[PDB]
C-alpha cells in the first residue's frame, strides 16, 4: 500500500467489440419516448414507421399478433411494445379546401369549406360542422331557401341579408 502510484496495482478492463457477418446479439438500450394519443404524431413502433393519430382501440389482438392490417395492407392497429395495449392508427386528417363565394362583382366576402375534416383540426368566426365538412365564414340559418351555391349533403350557401353568406 505504501508504494508509489507507478508501482501500485491497477485493475484494467479492455472492452473489445467483435463485429462479424453474423446477426448481432448485443445492442444498446433504445430510447423509447412517451406515448401520445389523439394527436397527429410521427410514430415508430419496433422499427415500423408511420404518421397518424393513435387512439385507444377495442380490437381483440391475439397475444402474439403485433400489427393490424386491412385490405389496404396498411397498418391499421399496433400493439404498444412496452405496455401491451392495442392502438388504432388513423391517417392524419386532410381534405379539399373550397371557397363558397358570391360573384366578385357582387361582393368579396367568401366562406371556406374544408371538405371531410372535423371542426377540430382547422386552425380557424362562425363555424358549422356540416356532413360535407367544416364550413367557416358561413352563418347557419334555420330557414330553408332554394339552393343557390350547392355545398353538399343537403347544405347550400347563399349571399343574402349587412348581407352575409348563410348556409342552410
Amino acid at each position: 500500500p505504501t508504494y508509489g502510484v507507478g508501482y501500485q496495482p491497477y485493475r484494467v478492463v479492455v472492452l473489445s467489440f467483435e463485429l462479424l457477418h453474423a446477426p448481432a446479439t448485443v445492442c444498446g438500450p433504445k430510447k423509447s419516448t412517451n406515448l401520445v394519443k389523439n394527436k397527429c404524431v410521427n410514430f415508430n413502433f419496433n422499427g415500423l414507421t408511420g404518421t397518424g393519430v393513435l387512439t385507444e382501440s377495442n380490437k381483440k389482438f391475439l397475444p402474439f399478433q403485433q400489427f393490424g392490417r386491412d385490405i389496404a395492407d396498411t397498418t391499421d392497429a399496433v400493439r404498444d411494445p412496452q405496455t401491451l395495449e392495442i392502438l388504432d392508427i388513423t391517417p392524419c386528417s386532410f381534405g379539399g379546401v373550397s371557397v363558397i363565394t358570391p360573384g366578385t362583382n357582387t361582393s368579396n366576402q367568401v366562406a371556406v369549406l374544408y371538405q371531410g375534416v372535423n371542426c377540430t383540426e382547422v386552425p380557424v368566426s362562425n363555424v358549422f360542422q356540416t356532413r360535407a365538412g367544416c364550413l367557416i365564414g358561413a352563418e347557419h340559418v334555420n330557414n330553408s331557401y332554394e339552393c343557390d351555391i350547392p355545398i353538399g349533403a343537403g347544405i347550400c350557401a347563399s349571399y343574402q341579408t349587412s348581407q352575409s353568406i348563410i348556409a342552410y
Binding site: T49, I71, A72, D73
Partner: protein
Amino acid sequence: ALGKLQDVVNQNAQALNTLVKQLSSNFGAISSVLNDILSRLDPPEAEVQ
C-alpha cells in the same frame, strides 16, 4: 335483381382497390414506399427510383 346497381358499386370499389394496390408495386424501384428510399438513399441516388 339488384345486380345492375350492386354490380356498378362493385366496379367502383374494385377500381379503387386496384388503384390502392398499385401503391404497393415496385415498378422497377428498389422499394414501393417513398419513405424507405428517402431514408436510405441520398437524393442523387434516390431520385432515379
